[PDB]
């Protein structure tokens, strides 16, 4: 579907593919995961 991955984007560490492509551009911001 589209605009359906809510819990996926909310986590960031585990989502799917494009949602699991932007999460990593900001993975360094977390440092030790929050």
| Domain regions of the chain by residue span | 1-34
Helix, strand or coil, per DSSP, at residue 20: helix
CB of 12 within 8 A of CB of 6?
Answer: no
- Chain center to CA of 16: 8
**Is the CB of residue 5 less than 8 Å from the CB of residue 16?**
yes
How far apart CA 28 and CA 3 sit, in angstroms, is 26
Distance CA 19, CA 33 (A): 17
Can you tell me the distance from the alpha carbon of 19 to that of 5, in angstroms, rounded to the nearest whole number? 8
């Amino acid at each position: 579907s589209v605009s359906e991955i809510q819990l996926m984007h909310n986590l960031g560490k585990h989502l799917n593919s494009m949602e699991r492509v932007e999460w990593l551009r900001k993975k360094l911001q977390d440092v030790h995961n929050f």
